[PDB]
Design a binder for these strands. Structure first.
Ligand SMILES: [Mg+2]
Lengths: 51, 161, 165, 160, 163, 575, 126, 142, 141, 154
RNA sequence: CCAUGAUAAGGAUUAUAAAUUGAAAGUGUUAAUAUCAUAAUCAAAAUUUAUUAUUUAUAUUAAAUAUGUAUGUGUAGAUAAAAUAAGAA
């Protein structure tokens, strides 16, 4: 949710915390793990498309 | 992906400097200035900050004053009356050859900041405690006003015989 | 407040009559009208400026509609929109051109009919006349430039240029 | 004839808090709505700003919307009534006519013959006198009938 | 154009431009001449037919005159055609008010909110039940007041669902 | 109307120069000219009129034209004798003389010392002023690359002007010759001066109840849905709708069986068909155009071709395409258009169950067209229903089984005998088979790729209100509803005190419009304009951020660039 | 631009009205504005209650005409009316300089100036 | 213009520091195109609706021999990462390349992933005077 | 109008330097973005100071009386649910209706940047102590 | 009080020089008078001011009376005397107003603009929610939330 | 790319009445000197240029894409504008 209307409705469940690497002391994000290699999706295109 | 251990060209470039001063061109120092008030002189800070009296405030004033009348409180009335009596005394006529100093010509160009600076400092120098042309003190006789609480109408029962 | 809009069919009433919504639909058939279903009822705003005799700017019509987010990209905007065909953009398109009379007629035509011949532009003519006047004193500051080189590079079987000094 | 502010004051040298002068986007203007137009602080022209917030035309448009809202709001707090669609036969005699739509003809007088000259558009009717028409089903009247004051009756104001 | 664009190549497209700029045809008729005896003896446009007409065409009516502006086509011929079509169509619908009362457009009355005199009875609604109740509520209050300092209406007659 | 105020044909000539006195003097000239040509023409029409008044015959044709009404004002077919008709004619001609004399007399007022051509009483034609067109050009007179300041300080104001006089001539009749001289005045027009011609004349239009009939509303209503964007291009035909003037007689029929079927008198049917003395089964007949029950082309019921026992080609099942293309009289490609299933499985229709005839071949029956049933109002009697449907009370009674009181009934069955019926669905609507004929390829590809649905939104989308905004969406967003909210009595009843007797404050049976003047789609949840300032300020209504757009005004670009195609007076009024 | 319609009230209840609104509300209760409109009835040595005036705005219309300049205009209007009604009253009015028209305008708008009116742009030595 | 950085330097005058009507400047140079926003990430310098289709430039329109750089308004798609093909954008000095794929790019324009004004400043394209001035600004060290 | 002087040549190895700089500028921007989204959502979820100004009324009044009563018993759960962010707080106060018209007109609320401070904030300096490495637009703790 | 922000203070004579525009703007003078009157206190100084200024405005389009050549400079000295007298009466007024308004705000539970004195409540200028985190002229740090000058109940 | 022309900016003593507070002395593009070369916007783009009035603390990103940075005692030097429906002696 953008700041305007619903902002307080955001949840920590939207956070992909498993994607990055964090500093224990600062509670801040130092590095990012690699996205593309291990990425598995049954749906590159939407389900309803058959090429 | 996979954030690098080093950045070759990123942190390599010359860092931008933190500005030394503020205001115009980031060159102006932090110091005491003309706009500074003094809280040590008189009831009103000097030079006086802008003040806005709103009709809203007037109606609040009215309800306060009424409610004060009805509770038989003569105190704040008497404070106010004293203040008025002290500062409203008619300013004396100044003697020939007494005028407020102007800024002398041919010092700076006409467009220059010196002018205002001089005005501001001269007035900052004369606080209302320094106004000797208005007669405030225990010495002064005040023909137009009542002297103390006894003489005001809410004391009227003492005035009867 | 927030309510559900409602409609009482004329069969249900203890006197039949034409409901105003019905008429609205009759009208929308006759002059074809897009009913905007998502139109908020809370947004009715007369445009103060142009619709009130109080402001010097008063046209008696709703000059603009006041919607802050309105933009040219929206589909509804495209439905009520004027097309550039046969508007001033066209008149500009056709009558504003570098040599004005090339709007009135083909140049070659005009010239061939009036003069017996086609005539150069004045600028070209300046170039030429100067070529003449200055070839008549100095020479060989020059260069021979053309569209096609094959005419000078193999000249015909005759063609023996007169030697010069 | 309103004395309020319809116009966004033009941009100039920065106005600062003074006797007789306040900042341009100061909270006190337009009921606080200038919050929407405000870029706070010593703004860096080269790197920072939001262009629309210094632009005369845009700002002024936003203000015009805001004013329109205020007026709308006040004309709708002005209403004590609803529009009810009542079939031609049942309705009071002065409405039995033809009534052109808004801005179509001259503003029309209700009943010039009976000495009421007033806008029929703005004529409002009491929910009490339409009771029998509006709630036929209910039988016994759900609103008790209006008590009216006798103008010929001798009362305090008549000096009796 | 008699002036400039009169006689050369541009004369054609200018002329055409002007004709397509002017393609508007205005079509008027008074509503006084629509009220006449039709060939079957019925009055063609009567009071309700006019009411339905006026609500049908909104701003297309003024001063008791119906005026249709047909711009749809590039040429004036087709706009008289289009205009006459929309007119006979609008009359076709507006005539429905002669079929019976169910088509007579409703009158829109501004009916006031219930007046003050009637709004007063709003405090006496269900009077007895409320008084006899208020005593028991006073009891529950007098008892709740022994335990705690402040007694909410939510501890008495008000229900707030917990979950 | 008399004197100045009224005319048959009004011409307005708008003259435009570059200099004021140019157009003024021009107006004087053209005006004098039209004064003389005007006098001439109107004089001639006057001598004609005077002759006509002195005496003359009456048309057979005019006489006929007076006598055509079924019933005139006195409630019977009226006989106008030629005397009376001549009396009408004479009245109107007397009026025409009045107006001719008016014009001619005005023409003779403006003598040299006394000429004033602005006032309409003093001269014909007269002249109105029209506000001059004035455009101010504002621009840099410096060529400087160096400094903005200096460019600004150099700014010149110049203007283009165009000046307009308008010439008004109101005439009591329409002469082609006057129009000719008048259109011709453009050829001797002054130097650098142009003109416009506004003609406003009177013209008989004709309203047919034949082509644009007056009918009851459909027994199915039309929703807001028939009106979306491009509903104009898809869901509707262009009026008038096509009604058949030709009809085939069914077997067991007689003249008035057919007449009672078509909704007309027997006489009528005999006269439109006057050629034929008798009507056998299977013959084509002319529907009298005043008939009530006339059918629309292609009734909404699709013609269906079952496979069944067919031709002698099998006597079992129909197989190849062009066989059915011969059966239904269409090209094979149409039949392939309509059936997307039977095209994609195969051409030999292997396994397929049926076929759907192209829209062109469908036939309407009075059974599919007109609703068999009728809705009964609260106050209804059989008398009223009978009047509404034009039927005799007894025929209604028969189909309705002698019922007397209609109160317990929502619906009453309509006699096939009735004159004014209800159509099953709006005629001017576009049958769906057409719009589907447009889209045929896609409807095939929907089956091929097996598309059940294409989601327009992400899965969780309504969890985030401000993020997904289609460009049909509008602020302020309307809140989800609540049951007891609409007024205080209901609220009190459901929430605060639950023993409350009155569950809702009195609700007037008739419709209450809470958004007004604004009309709104019924059954939709909506909001009312906000009274409380807070409700405005604290809502999600955005502010204008980018450049702003007007649908019309975008073409003439900015306020500062004001594009104009033609220099018409800003006041200029389309006739 | 204002136009005063002036008539004489034999009932001694006079009132002045601007664009259909009572003068009190239009000039908005500011006394120093309204006294200006009173003045010509003083200079003519007349009673204001004997006269009804309604004033019409022919210029740029605005939500509020209350301000001294518009007041000045109003005064001039009423005065000229009064002279048309009571001819000899023109002598005192003229001497008191009511009937006098001053010609003053805001400077025309102009791009050369910063604020659009009086202020020339910034100057820097090369 | 003073220095000719292109063809047009011959044709154009700067005319001092000169104001243009709102949101119309002749030469669009988006200096702000990459301007980090966490909360506004999907609404800033992107499609005004999430329901819009990708632009023309996300698709091969005709029979192409091939291209050098794809246009900067082409949105980064999951395939841009996965496929492992050359993705080129025309920036200055020459071309920018998406070499090191990441899923954090997806669904934004490469108008947004390419910094228009770099903090890296070559001194080989600068006049000695220009270098002096950049030193004034506290950009170049000296 | 001086004849424009020609621009000097590009440079050598600069194309690779620039490719590299932009490349790793983006790979940095990824952790910039990640960190800032964490900070933003974290802000969104965590509690804030009270958005109203206790120097005006209907707020100055003692916390045992008036508005606060209306807040304690009726509104409490709702206010704590939205973590006192000023937008839903003000909106809830609008919808409670027992204050009704005053929320905007009479009542007064802390300026935007002050109302944004974390719960338990003591000194005003806390406005400038928030992390500057993160791009939330002042929406981070 | 609505306008809370830090402010820029003008010297009195420049405030007075605004004449009919602000200092003497009829409207403002009236609501000041209303203040005094409501307090049960005469307005003498205000009345002197309005006398002086009413006259100033009346004659503002006229030329000053002829100045004949003096070696002595008495016309100059005397008209100057008169002038600084008037200035001084108006200083008395300007002071008076600022005073009474700070006091009356003191009774009305009102918070002033930033860095303003209220005689009995905030001796050092009062501040809350300034653009700057420290007290401007104290160079002392500011507490959050804004400092409260008055006891709670209203 | 050498290849003449021509219009800007720039307040210093003809005044008040029935009246204008903007000037000629020349600021890229314009007509007779020719003898290196195709450099021109139809989108989405690279800061070094004397010659430019930006929003400063109750509420703050929705339609062409629209600016992330500088809180620091209204604070150095030096600079800008105005006597025109306004109010200056
Ligand atoms: Mg030159």
């Amino acid at each position: 949710n953008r700041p305007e209307v619903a902002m307080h409705r955001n949840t920590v469940g939207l956070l992909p915390a498993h994607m990055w690497e964090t500093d224990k002391k600062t509670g801040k994000v130092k590095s990012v793990k690699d996205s593309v290699r291990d990425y598995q999706t049954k749906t590159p295109y939407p389900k309803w498309v058959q090429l | 992906t996979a954030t690098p251990e080093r950045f070759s060209v990123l942190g390599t470039t010359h860092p931008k400097p933190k500005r030394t001063g503020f205001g115009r061109n980031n060159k102006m120092r932090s110091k005491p200035s003309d706009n500074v008030a003094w809280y040590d002189k008189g009831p009103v800070e000097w030079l006086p900050r802008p003040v806005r009296l709103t009709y809203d405030h007037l109606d609040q004033l009215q309800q306060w004053t009424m409610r004060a009348t009805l509770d038989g409180r003569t105190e704040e009335f008497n404070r106010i009356r004293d203040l008025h009596r002290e500062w409203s005394q008619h300013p004396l006529m100044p003697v020939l050859g007494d005028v407020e100093p102007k800024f002398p010509l041919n010092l700076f160009k006409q467009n220059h900041r010196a002018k205002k600076r001089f005005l501001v400092r001269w007035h900052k120098a004369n606080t209302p405690a320094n106004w000797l042309w208005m007669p405030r003190g225990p010495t002064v006789v005040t023909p137009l006003h009542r002297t103390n609480p006894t003489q005001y109408p809410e004391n009227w029962k003492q005035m009867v015989q | 407040g927030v309510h559900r809009v409602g409609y009482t069919h004329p069969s249900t009433l203890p006197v039949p009559c034409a409901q105003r919504w019905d008429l609205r639909l009759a009208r929308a058939r006759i002059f074809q009208e897009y009913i905007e279903e998502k139109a908020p009822g809370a947004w009715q705003l007369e445009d103060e400026r142009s619709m009130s005799p109080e402001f010097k700017t008063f046209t008696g019509y709703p000059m603009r509609d006041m919607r802050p987010g309105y933009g040219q990209n929206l589909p509804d905007y495209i439905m009520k929109k004027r097309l550039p065909n046969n508007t001033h953009y066209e008149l500009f398109a056709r009558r504003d051109i570098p040599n004005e009379d090339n709007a009135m007629y083909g140049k070659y035509l005009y010239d061939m009919t009036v003069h017996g011949t086609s005539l150069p532009s004045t600028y070209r003519m300046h170039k030429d006349i100067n070529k003449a006047q200055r070839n008549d004193r100095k020479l060989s500051g020059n260069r021979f430039k053309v569209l096609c080189s094959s005419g000078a590079k193999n000249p015909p079987s005759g063609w023996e240029p007169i030697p010069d000094a | 004839v309103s004395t309020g502010e319809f116009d966004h004051p033009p941009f100039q040298f920065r106005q600062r808090h003074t006797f007789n002068t306040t900042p341009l986007h100061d909270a006190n203007r337009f009921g606080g709505r200038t919050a929407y137009l405000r870029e706070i602080g010593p703004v860096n022209i080269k790197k920072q700003g939001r262009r629309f917030k210094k632009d005369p035309r845009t700002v002024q448009f936003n203000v015009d919307v805001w004013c329109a809202q205020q007026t709308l709001r006040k004309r709708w707090k002005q209403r004590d009534w609803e529009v009810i669609e009542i079939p031609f036969r049942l309705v009071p005699r002065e409405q039995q006519r033809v009534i052109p739509e808004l801005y179509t003809d001259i503003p029309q007088m209700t009943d010039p013959a009976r000495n009421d000259f007033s806008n029929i558009r703005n004529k409002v009717y009491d929910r009490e006198e339409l009771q029998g028409v509006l709630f036929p089903a209910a039988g016994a009247m759900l609103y008790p009938p209006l008590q009216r004051v006798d103008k010929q009756a001798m009362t305090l104001d008549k000096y009796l | 154009d008699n002036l400039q664009y009169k006689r050369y190549d541009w004369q054609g497209w200018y002329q055409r431009m002007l004709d397509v700029h002017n393609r508007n045809v205005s079509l008027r008729c008074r509503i006084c001449d629509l009220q006449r005896l039709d060939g079957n003896g019925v009055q063609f446009v009567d009071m309700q037919t006019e009411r339905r007409l006026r609500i049908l065409a909104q701003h297309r009516v003024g001063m008791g005159v119906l005026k249709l502006d047909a711009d749809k086509y590039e040429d004036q011929a087709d706009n008289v055609t289009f205009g006459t079509t929309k007119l006979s169509e609008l009359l076709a619908d507006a005539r429905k008010a002669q079929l019976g009362e169910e088509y007579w457009p409703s009158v829109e009355l501004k009916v006031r909110k219930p007046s003050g005199q009637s709004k007063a009875h709003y405090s006496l609604i269900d009077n007895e039940r409320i008084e006899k109740r208020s005593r028991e509520l006073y009891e529950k209050y007098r008892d709740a007041k022994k335990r705690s300092l402040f007694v909410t209406p939510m501890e008495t007659w008000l229900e707030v669902k917990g979950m | 109307e008399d004197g100045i105020r009224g005319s048959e044909v009004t011409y307005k000539i708008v003259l435009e120069g570059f200099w004021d006195h140019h157009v003024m003097k021009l107006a004087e000239d053209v005006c004098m000219f039209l004064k003389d040509v005007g006098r001439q023409i109107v004089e001639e029409k006057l001598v004609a009129v005077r002759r006509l008044l002195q005496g003359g015959a009456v048309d057979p044709e005019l006489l006929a034209a007076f006598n055509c009404a079924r019933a005139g004002p006195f409630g019977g077919l009226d006989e106008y004798d030629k005397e009376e008709v001549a009396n009408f004619l004479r009245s109107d001609l007397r009026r025409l003389e009045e107006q001719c004399l008016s014009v001619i007399n005005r023409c003779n007022v403006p003598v040299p010392g006394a000429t004033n051509i602005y006032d309409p009483h003093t001269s014909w034609p007269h002249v109105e002023k029209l506000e001059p067109w004035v455009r101010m050009a504002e621009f840099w007179t410096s060529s400087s690359d160096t400094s903005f300041t200096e460019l600004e300080m150099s700014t010149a104001h110049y203007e283009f002007r165009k000046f307009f006089r308008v010439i008004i001539c109101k005439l009591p009749f329409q002469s082609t010759e006057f129009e000719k001289r008048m259109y011709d005045i453009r050829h001797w027009l002054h130097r650098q001066t142009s003109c416009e011609f506004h003609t406003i004349y009177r013209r008989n239009v004709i309203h047919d109840s034949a082509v644009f009939p007056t009918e009851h509303d459909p027994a199915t209503p039309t929703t807001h849905e028939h009106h979306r964007m491009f509903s104009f291009a898809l869901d509707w035909q262009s009026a008038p709708v096509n009604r058949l003037s030709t009809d085939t007689v069914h077997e067991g029929e007689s003249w008035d069986a057919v007449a009672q079927r078509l909704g007309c008198s027997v006489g009528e049917l005999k006269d439109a068909n006057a050629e034929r003395e008798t009507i056998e089964a299977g013959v084509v007949i002319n529907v009298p155009v005043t008939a009530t029950r006339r059918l629309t082309s292609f009734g909404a019921t699709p013609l269906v071709l079952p496979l069944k026992t067919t031709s002698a080609k099998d006597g079992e099942r129909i197989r190849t395409w062009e066989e059915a293309a011969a059966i239904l009289d269409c090209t094979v490609e149409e039949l392939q258009q309509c059936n997307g299933h039977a095209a994609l499985t195969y051409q030999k229709k292997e396994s397929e169950t049926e076929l759907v005839a192209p829209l062109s071949c469908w036939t309407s029956t009075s059974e599919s067209e007109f609703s068999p049933v009728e809705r009964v109002h609260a106050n209804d009697t059989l008398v009223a229903i009978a009047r509404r449907l034009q039927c005799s009370e007894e025929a209604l009674r028969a189909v309705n089984d002698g019922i007397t009181d209609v109160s317990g009934l929502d619906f009453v069955r309509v006699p096939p005998e009735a004159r004014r019926p209800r159509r099953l669905v709006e005629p001017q609507l576009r049958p769906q088979a057409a719009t589907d004929a447009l889209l045929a390829r896609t409807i095939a590809e929907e089956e091929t790729f097996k598309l059940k649905s294409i989601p327009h939104l992400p899965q969780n989308a309504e969890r985030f209100p401000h993020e997904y905004h289609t460009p049909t969406s509008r602020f302020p967003p309307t809140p989800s509803e609540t049951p007891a909210t609409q007024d205080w009595m209901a609220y009190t009843a459901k929430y605060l005190d639950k023993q409350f007797t009155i569950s809702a404050e009195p609700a007037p049976v008739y419709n209450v419009n809470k958004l007004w003047p604004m009309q709104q789609i019924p059954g939709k949840v909506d909001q009312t304009p906000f009274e409380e300032d807070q409700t405005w300020l604290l809502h999600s209504i955005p502010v204008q951020q980018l450049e702003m757009h007007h649908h019309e005004k975008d073409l003439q670009d900015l306020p500062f660039i004001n594009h104009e195609q033609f220099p018409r007076s800003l006041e200029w009024n389309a006739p | 631009h204002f136009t005063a319609l002036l008539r004489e009230n034999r009932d001694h209840n006079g009132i002045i009205t601007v664009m259909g609104k009572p003068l009190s509300l239009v000039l908005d209760n500011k006394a120093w504005l309204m006294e200006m409109v009173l003045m010509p009835f003083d200079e003519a040595n007349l009673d204001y209650r004997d006269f009804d005036a309604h004033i019409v705005s022919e210029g740029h219309a605005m939500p509020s005409i209350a301000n001294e300049i518009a007041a000045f205009a109003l005064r001039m209007a009423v005065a000229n009316a009064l002279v048309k009604l009571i001819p000899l009253t023109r002598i005192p009015l003229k001497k008191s300089g009511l009937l006098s028209v001053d010609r003053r305008r805001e400077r025309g708008q102009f791009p050369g100036y910063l604020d659009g009116k009086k202020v020339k742009r910034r100057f820097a030595k090369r | 213009l003073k220095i000719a950085k292109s063809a047009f330097g011959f044709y154009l005058a700067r005319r001092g520091q000169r104001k243009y009507p709102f949101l119309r400047r002749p030469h669009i140079k988006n200096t702000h195109s990459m301007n980090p926003s966490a909360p506004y990430f999907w609404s800033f310098m992107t499609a005004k609706s999430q329901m819009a289709f990708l632009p023309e430039e996300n698709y091969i329109t005709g029979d192409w021999t091939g291209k050098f750089f794809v246009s900067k308004r082409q949105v980064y798609t999951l395939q841009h990462a996965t496929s492992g093909a050359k993705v080129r954008v025309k920036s200055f000095p020459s071309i920018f390349e998406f070499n090191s794929p990441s899923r954090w790019n997806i669904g934004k324009e490469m108008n947004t992933l390419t910094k228009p004004r770099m903090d890296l400043i070559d001194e080989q394209m600068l006049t000695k005077k220009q270098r002096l001035d950049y030193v004034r600004a506290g950009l170049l060290p000296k | 109008w001086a004849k424009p002087k020609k621009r000097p040549k590009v440079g050598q190895g600069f194309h690779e330097k620039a490719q590299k700089w932009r490349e790793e500028y983006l790979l940095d921007r990824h952790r910039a973005l990640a960190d800032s989204l964490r900070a933003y959502v974290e802000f969104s979820t965590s509690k804030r100071v009270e958005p109203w100004d206790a120097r005006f009324k209907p707020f100055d009044r003692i916390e045992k009386d008036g508005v606060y009563v209306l807040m304690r018993y009726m509104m409490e759960e709702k206010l704590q649910l939205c973590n006192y962010h000023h937008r839903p707080v003000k909106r809830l106060f609008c919808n409670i209706g027992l204050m009704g018209p005053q929320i905007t007109t009479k009542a007064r609320w802390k300026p935007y940047r002050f109302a944004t401070n974390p719960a338990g904030t003591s000194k005003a300096e806390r406005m400038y102590q928030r992390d500057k490495t993160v791009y939330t637009h002042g929406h981070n703790d | 009080n609505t306008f809370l922000t830090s402010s820029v203070a003008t010297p009195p004579i420049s405030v007075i020089r605004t004449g009919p525009k602000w200092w003497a703007d009829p409207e403002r003078m009236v609501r000041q008078k209303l203040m005094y009157f409501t307090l049960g206190v005469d307005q003498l100084p205000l009345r002197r001011t309005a006398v002086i200024q009413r006259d100033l405005q009346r004659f503002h389009m006229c030329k000053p009376p002829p100045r004949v050549g003096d070696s002595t400079g008495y016309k100059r000295s005397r008209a100057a005397q008169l002038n600084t007298w008037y200035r001084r009466i108006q200083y008395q007024e300007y002071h008076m107003q600022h005073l009474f308004t700070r006091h009356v705000w003191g009774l009305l539970r009102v918070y002033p603009g930033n860095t303003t004195k209220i005689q009995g409540k905030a001796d050092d200028g009062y501040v809350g929610y300034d653009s700057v985190p420290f007290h401007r002229y104290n160079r002392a740090p500011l507490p959050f939330p804004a400092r409260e000058l008055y006891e709670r109940r209203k």
